[model samples]
Target chain A: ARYGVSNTSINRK
Target chain B: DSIDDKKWSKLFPRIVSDPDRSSNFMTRAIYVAFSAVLRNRNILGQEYFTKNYITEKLKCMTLCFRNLRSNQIAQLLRNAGDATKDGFLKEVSLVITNNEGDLEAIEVFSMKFIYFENGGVVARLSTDQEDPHFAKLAQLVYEGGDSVRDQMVTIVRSVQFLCTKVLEPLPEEFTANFRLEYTNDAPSNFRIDGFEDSSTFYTLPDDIQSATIGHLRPGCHAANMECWSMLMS
Candidate 1:
């Protein structure tokens, strides 16, 4: 069901 | 023995990377058909295996696998056993074989790498240059107003670029037949329509020119009355 990067909020400025 | 499940088990891992993602109706069907052929490879025996049949069959297969990526199609054919691989290569030869003739007489056929349902594909290979798909768009190039004209020109240029740069060079054998002819004379109907400056008016009147000065000077605009009278009388 899920794909690509898992941890979304890591690199946000 | 029903496509030899053991053989498919051996193939499934190699052919399909992720079963959960890959298990679609068409993929399974293609796999099954491929397995069946590999199983029956002895019976069919490659005697009547003309490239023509394979080419036609692949076209149908392409329509079926229209939604999939080309690499997937390549993979499908690759796993379809040696005969199918031969067929794919043979079709490349057939692609060139089908295009043999005078360059000008060869009708422009638009072929897209992908074909869609309602909108239809933008590119194809055929002798039918007057195909409605292109003719309808081309009609707008000349007939439509400024905005429509600009859009059509952009679309036409894109199609031309795709034809020359992208599509034409895809197949190696195609390079032999696909060539640009060089000639000294310009095209018979070609003309620089808006440039009305005579051979003398080399310099421009910098600021502003007449806005509504466009007119269609037909070939008969400079027709000699003396010659016309001589012929008619």
Candidate 2:
């Protein structure tokens, strides 16, 4: 998933 | 038929019901059992449910037995001081963190929060003219080089706070009277250890000041971020 700025990452693992 | 006929009453003969009620009773029992499992969201499968959820729930129940009068159940605790209750922190990561929901930031916030709460309380009560134990705790809270492990102070403070403010002069008087006398055998000023031993010290004995000096010189982490940020600011 991309948040449009600097590739914010959210890991639901 | 009913449980009186089919299941429970067969040996004990508690209730007297017919066959139709018995079958209905079984279905109701099954439904209740499954509903209890399903209501607890995040559980996965039958086997896993049995293995972890069921097992842990039983363990938590046993833990609950220790504080039957306590308002919150074992699994419900979700913060710094709460984490130490029933050893829930040993199981849940979120409860152990300084800040819940944010797994980032070194996850030390929970640790820091616990340490700070303990440390601050210990600092205050160290001067307590009444309890010598409070003084010993205060010495240790400032002694530990790191804030994470130095949180024994908060736990003690929490107990003392509960004793003085909550339990003795509990906001609701009747409830406190009933609880102290009847439900749980809790004395007003008793110092019982929960997560850690009451005698446990935060810093090394015989030389807390030396340790504090070393911590200051080495730039070792302080007990709470508030103090650290204040120092930097």
Candidate 3:
């Protein structure tokens, strides 16, 4: 459910 | 479920399919396609099939595109393997063309959205002629031409002191045979002392002698005496 958010802070950096 | 959640569920089978929570249709389609490619062992060439590797690569793609329709995500994943693997854009075109509502709307919706999500070069770096960084870099490449090459040679000459002198003593000695010989005698200030003998030390210029004396402090003398005894032994 947390991964479903628009800004869930994935490791793009 | 709220009205919006119910409506979203009607469009996408799962709650995670809402565009606000999931990435856009095309981005998710790419991940699904890549994931399927890894899971099926279609390419037996490498270590890409590991669970961690696949999850990591998918997350990397997912991170960059965090604002898209979650509703179509499941549908895109379902249709992923069927999409032809021509090129990246063509694969995306097929997935959206097959499942999404209108081709024209997809194009319109994705025009700018895809650019930012995919880090299209213009999004990462302004290519406009007015952009100072891009303009300066472009101007350097365009106007610098051979002058930059000339500077490269000059800098290489300086950097050689740091690199070649330390790394390649044997090569440096061998290459010394091809070096130019100065026909003129050594200048008065120059000291041409061969390391085998110390007779030339007395003949050194006053400034050189003073500098040498200045460095021969008590600590330096003790260290030098130890080294000298070691060499003699």
Candidate 4:
């Protein structure tokens, strides 16, 4: 469960 | 996550729960909850939750104890990291409530060592106030609160802060949406409602090849999605 500012925008709930 | 000690470690479970573990998704996720608790909870307490859970709960953790250098009596502040000293008492105060048993003996004793310690304003607020912000955090924790609103504010601030501080295009966004899934395994295609594309999913680096699968469909009328938890990892 890594999250990056970049990855977060690309991903969703 | 195997949900096993070998796989779970102290770190993974922490990451699994934290929304902010975005950048350090894997390795940094190691200490997981144990790590972010020190940073996120304090500000969150004052701004919203205001229960100051981090200040109260952080002191008794094994990691917190390690900051003491040695558990001996009358240790100087120099023995601990500034991070530890700055936050320890508040965290300890929270632990005095959230996790009484894990710190049964230590909690009682830690108070003694800090008798001569300078009292912080936040600690005074928690100790003297009837509605301790940290306790409110305790409520937000076990019993859910307005998580959607809180998360939204945090997300916006995070974006704004990064845009200003990082000096780069803002990246990462957590939608104010909820997805449904059956298996508690991987939170992947496992979802149906919110955003329904695999391309939008982000997981640990290794989960790429070994990501597990589950069956969880919409909670509404489309309840057809169903499957037993199975491992692809």
Candidate 5:
């Protein structure tokens, strides 16, 4: 697949 | 990342339990890590996770390899010389031990060299760290005491970084901040979290879509704010 990214905030586990 | 081919081949799995493609996240980690390693600075900080930051990284990546010009990982960096490049190493949870109670594996950056059924030797990047369907895959897991843990920080930073890197703004990069699905994705890129919507960080030009989004979310948009504001807020 093509290169890409995703996110998650700095918070709870 | 400095590991040679023979050593890398040895450490990477032969027939990994969780098989899949490589990750671009790891590629970005390689850049960020090596940048810090060489520059004596920490781009891994929350402040560095901006679209502009990535553009600079992209530019640095384009030049840095001239500084390996040299495998897929090495090749990808080399490829960046021309187009800045793209590819993968996915995310996977790796196990490391501790004093007692079954230490949990942390999710870190990863990638792989894929060999297909007939005629194929493709290097792919995905975020699982992923498959075992038909294609042959070896997952490159970066465990962060440096590789794995350090990488997760980069992964988290970039996931957060790229979220703010674009116009459509990655519907793919959502957060739990409730509204931060867009809120944090866009604002957190600011070295400071709450002020991303603000003008505290001083944005750039030749980039308009993101600028437009800032005006749209006026509450948090006023940056030029503080950093303890960074640590505290």
Candidate 6:
């Protein structure tokens, strides 16, 4: 997970 | 699809629809609620908005969206980011040599660009003009005590450059009514007790702070790169 999906995208969920 | 259907009916009638439409059903309720307050501009004008009822509404929105970046929400509404070269420098970094003559910089200023319905663009510059973010600028002013003219020149040129840079990003439609209001606010930043006030300047209310996750305050550690790194990280 060095470069996971952006925290913004996860928050969007 | 069980007792749930009957119970749901008891509370209120429900729209039983395709998942495609229903996915946004809950999300759209919030939009409807907002519309109850934010009616159409023309309609609100008839309701006496022209006389400044809209002013009060903007104030309430200002308080609620205090932490919001100026161009942040605007960018979302627009179709593309073809507006500017480096995109909007929503958080512009202020870099200069510190007292130790070492180059230091941080995202000290948060700018909001306003584009009105009538295609007027205004720079609201600071969150609220008395924003503690001016702490760094205040420090520079103090540091310019002996040769105030040069430092002030540097500041003026920097902002002039910014206003010009921000102008091209918008088509002539926005720039047509554009006004760079860099004056009307000079004294607010050059206070005698700037350092002291910047120390105890201001903070978001406890409730608002909790919502921001951490350190939503401004005016602290104006040019301390390490402090900024810690807070930003």
Question: What is the lDDT of every predicted structure here?
Answer: 0.20, 0.20, 0.19, 0.20, 0.22, 0.20
User: Where is model 3 more than 4 Å wrong at Cα?
Assistant: A1-13, B1-14, B22-26, B38-41, B44-46, B52-233
> Which whole-number lDDT from 0 to 100 does residue B159 have in model 2?
27
DockQ of each: 0.01, 0.02, 0.02, 0.07, 0.07, 0.02
Docking class of 4: incorrect
Candidates 5 and 6: which is better by lDDT? 5
Q: Fnat of each prediction?
A: 0.00, 0.00, 0.00, 0.09, 0.04, 0.00
Model 4 agreement with the true structure over A1-13: per-residue lDDT tens digits: 2110111111122
Per-residue C-alpha lDDT of model 4 across residues B134-165, encoded as one tens digit per residue: 33232222111122222322332332333244
lDDT of 6 by residue, B95-183 (tens): 11112112232111222121111111222233345434334332331121112222222323333333343322212111000001121
Q: Considering only N, C-alpha and C atoms within 3 Å, which residue pairs clash in candidate 1?
A: B110-B123, B110-B124, B111-B123, B111-B124, B112-B123
RMSD in order of candidates: 26.1, 23.8, 32.8, 24.0, 19.7, 23.9
How high is each candidate's interface RMSD, in Å?
A: 27.5, 23.9, 33.7, 17.5, 15.6, 19.0
Interface RMSD of 4: 17.5
True contacts kept of 4: 0.09
Q: Measured with DockQ on alpha carbons, how good is candidate 5? A: 0.07
In candidate 2, position B201 carries an lDDT of: 13
Q: Across residues A1-13, which tens digit of lDDT does each residue of candidate 2 receive? A: 0000101111222
Query: Which candidate leads the pack in lDDT?
Result: 5
| Pairs with backbone N, CA or C atoms under 3 Å apart (clashes), candidate 3 | B17-B70, B17-B71, B18-B70, B18-B71, B19-B68, B19-B69, B19-B70, B24-B68
